[PDB]
Amino acid sequence: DLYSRYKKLQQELEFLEVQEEYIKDEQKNLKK
């Protein structure tokens, strides 16, 4: 195991919020 499971999905969660934040600046630049 249980200890490793949120030792993968936490890092995946932080990464996913990070590039999920990047998408809005991508699509903002596309309009410019």
Partner 1 sequence: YLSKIEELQLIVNDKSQNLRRLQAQRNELNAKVRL
Partner 2 sequence: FNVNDNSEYVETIIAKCIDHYTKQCVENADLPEGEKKPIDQRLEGIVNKMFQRCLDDHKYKQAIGIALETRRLDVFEKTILESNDVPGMLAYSLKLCMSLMQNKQFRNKVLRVLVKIYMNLEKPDFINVCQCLIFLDDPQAVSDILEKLVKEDNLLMAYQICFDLYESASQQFLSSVIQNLRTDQTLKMIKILSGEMAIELHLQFLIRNNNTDLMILKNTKDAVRNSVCHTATVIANSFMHCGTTSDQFLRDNLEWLARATNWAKFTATASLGVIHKGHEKEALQLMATYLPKDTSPGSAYQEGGGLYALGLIHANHGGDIIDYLLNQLKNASNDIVRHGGSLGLGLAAMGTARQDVYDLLKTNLYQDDAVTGEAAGLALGLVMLGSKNAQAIEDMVGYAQETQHEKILRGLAVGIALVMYGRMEEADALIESLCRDKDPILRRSGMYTVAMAYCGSGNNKAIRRLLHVAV
Q: Phi, psi (5° rounding) for residue 27?
A: -70, -25
Q: Is 5 a residue that touches partner 2 (CB under 8 A)? A: no
To partner 1, the closest distance from the beta carbon of 6 in angstroms equals: 4
27: helix, coil or strand? Answer: helix
Interface characters, 1-30, with partner 1 (x: CB under 8 A): -xx-xx--xx-xx--xx-xx--xx-xx--x
To partner 1, the closest distance from the beta carbon of 29 in angstroms equals: 9
Question: How far, in Å, CA of 14 to CA of 21, rounded?
Answer: 11
The residues of the shown chain that bind partner 1, judged by CB under 8 A, are 2-3, 5-6, 9-10, 12-13, 16-17, 19-20, 23-24, 26-27, 30-31
